[PDB]
């Protein structure tokens, strides 16, 4: 009949209802996000006199778990004393509040993936992608740090969103995927389109991940469409080795599920499973980005800043971000020092 006094539902959590008021301080709104973990709703202080955007995980044992160790990692994060803080989002604070978990964000703007889909799925200036690329770059800095370690695992357009509406400043978000490095305990994580391929193969991994799907996303951000979008992950894997060729062998070697989409000729050569798809390679990611072509799809010609060298710029970056081998990929202090960002 009813569950936790009526205020929860058939899916434990909290029933949102606009101009609520709890505990004579915040004020609900209305609901902004909805997922496993459970929701997200806009709401204002009255203390601070803000609005702030607050995290109700639902009501069981689970989902309180995870969301606790979310927690202790924002506020291990919180504490450290750098500026490079200011690109992961922060949490002002947490509480409970009847037999739910709630954590208060700062209030956020657009995620990537809406901005993508207002430009009708065309993409952005490079100008801008260099901004975003440079912040990003930034973060991933901040998290490698040694006494934080920490790999977010679910790097995608709409887990980046935007502080103002009106500045190039964005932030990470939603945290609950978070893993500070050790041991591998999970093997099917990152989002499909962006899981790097040590994961795809099953192999050890590490924050090199995170950097992989940073590449496939800044592309994104100035093609429109996503890098490597398979229906699954046989597909996806041909998707990558159709544009970087097929992996090392040193590397399919290692890989216990290399056998997933490659076989092993008698030479010892590795070569891709039949099911479609261009032969490895040959969708160049020089093509791809139209660096002497005047950018994705020809809308780039004779824009500002958008020349053969910054492309050039641009997809010596990516390349060096896509690295197959996670121990040649590029790290991000050096991601830094790029010559696209002079
Ligand atoms: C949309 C949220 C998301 O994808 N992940 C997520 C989950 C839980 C919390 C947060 C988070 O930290 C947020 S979410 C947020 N504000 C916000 C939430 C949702 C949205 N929208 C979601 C997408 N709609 C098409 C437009 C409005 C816009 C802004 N501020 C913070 N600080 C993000």
Redesign the pocket.
């Known amino acids: 009949k009813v569950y936790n006094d009526g205020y929860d539902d058939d899916n434990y959590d909290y029933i949102v209802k606009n101009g609520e008021k709890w505990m004579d301080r915040y004020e609900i709104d209305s609901l902004?996000?909805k997922?496993s973990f459970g929701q997200?709703v806009?709401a204002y202080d009255r203390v601070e006199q803000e609005w702030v955007?607050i995290?109700i995980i639902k009501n069981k044992k689970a989902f309180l778990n995870q969301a606790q160790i979310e927690v202790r990692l924002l506020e291990l994060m919180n504490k450290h004393d750098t500026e490079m803080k200011y690109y992961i989002?922060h949490l002002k604070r947490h509480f409970m509040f009847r037999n739910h978990l709630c954590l208060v964000?700062?209030?956020?703007?657009?995620?990537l993936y809406?901005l993508l889909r207002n430009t009708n799925f065309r993409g952005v200036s490079l100008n801008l992608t260099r901004k975003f690329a440079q912040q990003m770059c930034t973060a991933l800095l901040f998290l490698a740090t040694p006494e934080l370690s920490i790999i977010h695992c679910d790097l995608k357009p709409?887990?980046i969103?935007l502080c103002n509406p009106k500045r190039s400043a964005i932030k990470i978000?939603?945290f609950g995927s978070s893993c500070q490095l050790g041991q591998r305990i999970y093997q099917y994580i990152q989002s499909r389109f962006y899981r790097s391929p040590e994961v795809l193969l099953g192999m050890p991994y590490d924050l090199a991940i995170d950097m992989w799907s940073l590449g496939c996303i800044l592309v994104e951000m100035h093609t429109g469409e996503p890098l490597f979008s398979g229906a699954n992950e046989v597909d996806q894997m041909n998707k990558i080795v159709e544009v970087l060729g097929i992996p090392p062998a040193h590397i399919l070697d290692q890989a216990p599920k290399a056998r997933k989409f490659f076989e092993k000729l008698p030479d010892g050569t590795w070569n891709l499973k039949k099911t479609e798809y261009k032969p490895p390679g040959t969708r160049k990611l020089h093509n791809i980005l139209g660096v002497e072509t005047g950018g994705p799809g020809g809308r780039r010609a004779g824009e500002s800043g958008h020349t053969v060298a910054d492309y050039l710029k641009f997809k010596d970056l990516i390349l060096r971000m896509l690295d197959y081998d996670p121990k040649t990929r590029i790290q991000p202090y050096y991601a830094l020092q790029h010559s696209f960002f002079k």
């Open positions: 902004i996000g997922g997200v806009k955007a995290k989002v964000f700062e209030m956020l703007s657009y995620n809406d709409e887990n969103l978000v939603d």
